[PDB]
Amino acid sequence: SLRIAKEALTFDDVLLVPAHSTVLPNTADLSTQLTKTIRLNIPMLSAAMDTVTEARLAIALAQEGGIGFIHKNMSIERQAEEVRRVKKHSGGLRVGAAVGAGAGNEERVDALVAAGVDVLLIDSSHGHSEGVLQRIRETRAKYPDLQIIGGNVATAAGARALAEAGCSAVKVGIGPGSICTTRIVTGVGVPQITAVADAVEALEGTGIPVIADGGIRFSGDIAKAIAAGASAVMVGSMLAGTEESPGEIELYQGRSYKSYRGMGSLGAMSKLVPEGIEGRVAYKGRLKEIIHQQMGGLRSCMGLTGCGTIDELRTKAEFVRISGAG
Amino acid sequence: SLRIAKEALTFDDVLLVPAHSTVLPNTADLSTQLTKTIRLNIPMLSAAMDTVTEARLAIALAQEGGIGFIHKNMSIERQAEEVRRVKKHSGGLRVGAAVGAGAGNEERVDALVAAGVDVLLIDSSHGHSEGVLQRIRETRAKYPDLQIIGGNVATAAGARALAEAGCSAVKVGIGPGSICTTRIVTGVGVPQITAVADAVEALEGTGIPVIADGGIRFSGDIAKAIAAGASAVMVGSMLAGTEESPGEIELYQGRSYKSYRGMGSLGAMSKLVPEGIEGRVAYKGRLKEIIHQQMGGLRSCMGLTGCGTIDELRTKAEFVRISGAG
Amino acid sequence: SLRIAKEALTFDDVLLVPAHSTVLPNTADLSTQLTKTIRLNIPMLSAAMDTVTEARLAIALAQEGGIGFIHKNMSIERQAEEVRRVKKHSGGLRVGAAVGAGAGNEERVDALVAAGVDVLLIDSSHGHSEGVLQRIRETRAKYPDLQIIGGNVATAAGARALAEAGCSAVKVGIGPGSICTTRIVTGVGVPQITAVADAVEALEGTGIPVIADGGIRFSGDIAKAIAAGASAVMVGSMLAGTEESPGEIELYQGRSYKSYRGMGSLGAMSKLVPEGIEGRVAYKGRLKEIIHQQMGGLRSCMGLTGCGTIDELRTKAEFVRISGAG
Amino acid sequence: SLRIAKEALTFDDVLLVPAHSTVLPNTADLSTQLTKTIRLNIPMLSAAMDTVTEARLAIALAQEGGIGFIHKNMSIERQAEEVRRVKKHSGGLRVGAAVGAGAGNEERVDALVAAGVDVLLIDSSHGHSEGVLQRIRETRAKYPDLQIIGGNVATAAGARALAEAGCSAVKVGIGPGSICTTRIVTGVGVPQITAVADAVEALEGTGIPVIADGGIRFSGDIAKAIAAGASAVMVGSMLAGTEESPGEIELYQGRSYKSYRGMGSLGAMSKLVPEGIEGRVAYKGRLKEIIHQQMGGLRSCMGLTGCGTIDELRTKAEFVRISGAG
Ligand SMILES: C[C@H](Nc1ccc2ncc3c(c2c1)CCOC3)C(=O)Nc1ccc(Cl)nc1
Ligand SMILES: C[C@H](Nc1ccc2ncc3c(c2c1)CCOC3)C(=O)Nc1ccc(Cl)nc1
Ligand SMILES: C[C@H](Nc1ccc2ncc3c(c2c1)CCOC3)C(=O)Nc1ccc(Cl)nc1
Ligand SMILES: C[C@H](Nc1ccc2ncc3c(c2c1)CCOC3)C(=O)Nc1ccc(Cl)nc1
Ligand SMILES: O=c1[nH]cnc2c1ncn2[C@@H]1O[C@H](COP(=O)(O)O)[C@@H](O)[C@H]1O
Ligand SMILES: O=c1[nH]cnc2c1ncn2[C@@H]1O[C@H](COP(=O)(O)O)[C@@H](O)[C@H]1O
Ligand SMILES: O=c1[nH]cnc2c1ncn2[C@@H]1O[C@H](COP(=O)(O)O)[C@@H](O)[C@H]1O
Ligand SMILES: O=c1[nH]cnc2c1ncn2[C@@H]1O[C@H](COP(=O)(O)O)[C@@H](O)[C@H]1O
Description:
The structure is a homotetramer. Chain A is an alpha/beta fold. Chain A contains eleven helices and 16 strands. An eight-stranded parallel beta sheet of chain A has the order 5-12-11-10-9-8-7-6. In chain A, strands 13-14-15 form a three-stranded antiparallel beta sheet. Chain A binds chain B through residues 9, 11, 14-22, 25, 193-194, 197, 201, 218-224, 227-228, 293, 296-301, 303-306, 317-326, and chain B through 1-10, 12-13, 126, 128-130, 153-155, 157-158, 161, 174-175, 182-191, 194, 272-273, 275, 324. The complex binds the ligand C[C@H](Nc1ccc2ncc3c(c2c1)CCOC3)C(=O)Nc1ccc(Cl)nc1 (4 copies) and inosinic acid (4 copies). One inosinic acid (IMP) binds at residues 47, 49, 152, 173, 177-180, 182, 213-216, 234-238, 262-265, 275-276 of chain C. Chains A, B, C, D: Belongs to the IMPDH/GMPR family. Chains A, B, C, D: NAD(+) binds at residues 123-125, 173-175.
């Protein structure tokens, strides 16, 4: 008999249900606990990607109430410098930085803690790997107060493994990324709505938040990820092509573009077979207007669902399952 | 566990079942109770939109046996004048007018009642909001005999809330509109067939009719909405581009067009993020031929289902659920 | 609660299961009982349409082992002449002719019986209509030995109604036609695989065969309709554009075409709203090669399923349900 | 009632679940038992097709750790020569050869055994046919030690029939081929994921491996077929257009192509109606790079699922069912 664990749902499979409301979109509270000690003003994390987050983007997002994650596709010294630029800014801004879950990263982590990183991201393509769990147990034992986000997982067992290893927050997402080809290359993936709810259910009562990472295309996807139980979302494509993102603006035929590629793409990699594509994204302009539009969508959802806080959206809002016709 | 209330169906998910019939399409009775006191000759209401209903369209539809709803995107004096033009016509024509569910609308409602409005439409994007319920309770207490339609809702709880608040009829539709982007922007919506049946079930035995508002593309959709339990349907796109609708006819490249936009579009709005698009619809001609074609479709359905009246269609006709292949 | 009688399946929703076989495709017996007295060599009936069957096509199909149905879109005298041409041919060929189920058709039926019609087709768009049932009871009482096919129905109740009224065979199909718009216009229809199995189950033990009429696109659809329980299939589009079909061959831009339209199209009609489209079909050539190809497909199915006769295919062959991905 | 045996799933209907892993993709063991006596280094078999496998391709694939199957669309002497070329190469390479399951093939089989064939492929379009079963029982009685692969089947009953007839391995696949039209022509087919799991369940405890033949488009499909229980996969389109495949390279408009057609196509056939198409595939280059890419995908899956061997992937890895939206 075919070993089918369950049916799994993606963003497009569901819709949120309107409910009794005393919530006006302008009155909605978007603050969220990224960890027990770290509270963000908006539930937005920028992707730890070489075409998405460096100090400039991390500064703009922190100013909006979110948090950026400096990618690991650079030298230890460059990364420590990027973190220092964000920490020494003005309005006491928070920053995160990504590290590989393999051997020979103890030095990179040391430099990042010295530079004043608020949250270390152990950036793995498979968080349920034993090597990853051991490295986070080792980072936790060395730095007992350091806020650590571990990922990625897409199951209840994977979420429990990261929480037991010492993670302050667990990142969910195996295969949902806009630039991901893991589903086609390996045949592995878990539809994000189910992946998030499974991870959140596993971590209930622990106070360990879940980050929904990947596949957010519209502000409606943010709302769905949060009502599935995520405390925050991580976005790549949504912030790619913004003025603040790294890389130069290109001109194809009148229209402005920026590069956007998976960290598992042939380009980002230069041994594993690629699990990401290399693409051009239309220039989005200033990050501030993107955040205002996306958070506005979330605000209107909160009004329609009668959830005045991120915690209410996470625990009260209901879904309906829809067909391909829906 | 993911909080999935139920699976929800849209027009395309179902088909009506042919049954024993003594009904000829030409013998079918299309009359319906919009409220306990108001009976329409056809189950058609025109959308309270600035690109759909003003006095001219409200006059043509009333003549066909339906009812128009003058939009709120104008001055109190202009709206009172539009209603007066319809009431003082010839064959004792009925009219409705839309009002916002916010504060500072008591004056607009006063002018509309004075002008002779037959039915006041409390036009909300979220009828289950406390503010809306309170304003309709206040309008009901001030005007105890005034026919009031309240909306929009898409749940059993929402329908009961509007009926208890004093509504003479309840309007259903959260996200089904042809020009709606609420599903993408907020992630909120309820597939219309389920939304209608849920609202009708909640109001059974109260004599409060349900209006199916939004997503009607074909005459088959009208039949489906009515068999789901709606007493009448409200149409926007179906009447957009008619000669009687407001705005001027445009010429793009040989072909004639009219503007059609959501009331939550950037244009109609000029603070909330837009929940509607701005578009061009092909010129449809005289409203009379559109009504004849659409009601003819409904008539043939009544013949195929053996339902001689709107009430029989609402309570006897059965559906089959179909797949994406169907 | 939404009145959903059941889920209903179409051809594309299912696949036939390969089984143990001693059947070679060349050894397969395609003969079938159209009625208790009439046996066809192939399970093919041509559609009673003005762009499909007249004496020439009825002659070619009868020669292949099937039966044609002369359409009613002509004078009583022309129709009687068409039937005479087929009956007085060479190898003792069988013919059918279509009549409307309304009043003022007694005369048309009289002329057709005189001309030597083997099977009268009471051609209704809604066979479950009381008027239709009464007219077939009247034809049965007048002509007790005349083979009568009544249709169309798409339910168990509809099949029983036609069988009780006196039908020698029942025709199934409400909305499946390639040129049908009833599903969009009226919202009524039943996916054909379910419609056929329901009608066959209702008629079990009566010896009244079921004809699957409409939506056959490929030879695989013929096999599916028969395994659903149909004794034969009726085809319109599959035979449209053949040399033998009525009308002239048109030249658009190098390529040859023939007209194909629904009997409920604006053209065929020239009062009801249209339920059919008017189109051009590519010229198919001689009917003989079409039949050889389509019956060859059926033969290979019989080999794969191990069903040596039409009766075995109807009662032994199994299906699997597939998804949109399948 | 419609005779629906069950719902059946294809590759696109499912995804593999990530699990706890101590497996690095580079450490994964790809070896598999094609039969009790034959062990391959990679789970890849090339299709016995005239546009896919001849001695050159069979040599390249064997060198990669797989096995080729020389097609039967040639003379007995040519086929015996092709097998001799592979057997007499260098690093003791294994080869297979295809034979028809009809009468007058005893001579072809005799020549192939003499030439040193390691595995005889009884290549039938319907393995559950009595003729096929009898011919393999006869080959088994004549050659008691000869490794025989019999196919194709897509049911538990079909797998048991081939195993009881003497097959050393059973090949699964009715209708999944990229170039197959059997589903459209005959209406017969079984979605491959279900077909494989059903055949594997039927053969549990017998030590008779199952080959998943047809529809493999991506390396993710290989992983899915193996986790469904297949010990190996057979590929046609994946190896078509490689330098090693038969036929000449064509130039259409700057781009290089090779022919790829079904063995049931009009061309390969030159009596049955065609069940295959004739097409052009883009030139893929050297087989070595294709294998490296595809096996790399499989390796990454093994890392993500924590399955270090083909046997672990076959018996431990779990799936989730996904929607059309997934
Ligand atoms: C080549 C591939 N590159 C990346 C890079 C960044 C990623 N970031 C997030 C995610 C994925 C990513 C894949 C894939 C799964 O979904 C989330 C990768 O590392 N493959 C991989 C497979 C199996 C194992 Cl044991 N180890 C590694
Ligand atoms: C911007 C948006 N504009 C409109 C205007 C007309 C509408 N008319 C009907 C419907 C919708 C409409 C949206 C949306 C839901 O489906 C039916 C709107 O008002 N958003 C909104 C969201 C949450 C809350 Cl608490 N308050 C208001
Ligand atoms: C206009 C329409 N014209 C046709 C003509 C031929 C047909 N032939 C087969 C079928 C249909 C056909 C419709 C429609 C249903 O599916 C099978 C028709 O007569 N409508 C109709 C509707 C309700 C009632 Cl009481 N009476 C008649
Ligand atoms: C014409 C057709 N030609 C082929 C050739 C190679 C194939 N190879 C694999 C498969 C199929 C193939 C069909 C079809 C089923 O799926 C797998 C074929 O032989 N039809 C057929 C049908 C019924 C019976 Cl009793 N005998 C034979
Ligand atoms: O090459 C890759 N393959 C798979 N996932 C990737 C790759 N690069 C980044 N990701 C993931 O995709 C996310 C971005 O998803 P997006 O917001 O849908 O574009 C990142 O935060 C990572 O979790
Ligand atoms: O901007 C908008 N967003 C969402 N719904 C809207 C908007 N404007 C109007 N509507 C709804 O859409 C209906 C028209 O739907 P239609 O008939 O499908 O075009 C109206 O009667 C309103 O209920
Ligand atoms: O205008 C029409 N509307 C609906 N059904 C029609 C019409 N004309 C013919 N039909 C049906 O469609 C069948 C032909 O279906 P086809 O083989 O899919 O083209 C006929 O035999 C009739 O039952
Ligand atoms: O004409 C044909 N019809 C149906 N199946 C075929 C035909 N020729 C080959 N096959 C099957 O299709 C497989 C190739 O599938 P692919 O890898 O998806 O291209 C072969 O190994 C055969 O089992």
